[PDB]
Write a protein that binds this ligand. Sequence first.
Ligand SMILES: NCc1cnc2ccccc2c1
Ligand SMILES: NCc1cnc2ccccc2c1
Length: 330
Amino acid sequence: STGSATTTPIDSLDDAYITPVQIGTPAQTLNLDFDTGSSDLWVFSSETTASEVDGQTIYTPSKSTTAKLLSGATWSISYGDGSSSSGDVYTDTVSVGGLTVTGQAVESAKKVSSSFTEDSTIDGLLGLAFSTLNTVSPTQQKTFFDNAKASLDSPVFTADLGYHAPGTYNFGFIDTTAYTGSITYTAVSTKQGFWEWTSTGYAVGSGTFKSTSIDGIADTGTTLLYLPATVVSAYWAQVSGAKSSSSVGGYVFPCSATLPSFTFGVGSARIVIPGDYIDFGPISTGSSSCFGGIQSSAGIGINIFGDVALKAAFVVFNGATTPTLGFASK
Ligand SMILES: NCc1cnc2ccccc2c1
Ligand SMILES: NCc1cnc2ccccc2c1
């Protein structure tokens, strides 16, 4: 089997991407944030605290003839951005782009943090990291990909995120029309539950490539590119007037700037992030200070190849017995 679904930026900055997902019988379609950095499929629901729902579409399990309470199961998650959610668990039929899993754990939110309530565009998350990170207790549950894997034509999914434009998630096949040149594969460690890999180095604009190992995670559920402070200082030193602002919480730059590109290594291959991808716009409405898309990972404890980096590539999440990542230009 295969599936193919379009993913759409939630706003003009590509702050996140939503993908429609069918849950239940008859189908209830919710727009979920596909997150290769976490392993829970959770949704706004008919059980969510009413004051914490502001415009989201909700899953109502009582209206699904295939929904079953997973007796005694609860879940509770915190994300790197300080956001959180928790609740109870149903199993139900879940379809993405024509690919159907029966008996998927659908984690129904009873509580969500302020950031989730305040974002009307995201109805929940669909985790695509390894199932060892799933938070369901007392019986840990499998991701949508882990449940689908054995049925797929090939045990893979791909992320093709757009810059200010829709993109695609595919399951079970690699669309050879969707990228240029060849796919370079690189080793993955699953020891922390992430798609964790080692970049071979970086360049700033037309500068020389620096060969240096940068361990980090491929994370579709993080907006920005978080890298070591040495690398980030080198990038922003090429932008007149750029500075790290403790009050704003990262590097800012004059909105009148033209930003340089950023290149990262995948083995002997190179992925180029255009400068425009690194502009996240005014820090507040009408400001001439703009927020940078490359930020320090100091204090996060891991480097994160988020959407700023991934949207410059066609990315293969290879779930073979020994997982690997693939990157192509596009
Ligand atoms: N996309 C989910 C996510 C969020 N925040 C994180 C912070 C540190 C490490 C991994 C993280 C993964
Ligand atoms: N890194 C995963 C993640 C964390 N927090 C969020 C808050 C609001 C919307 C989407 C979010 C996604």
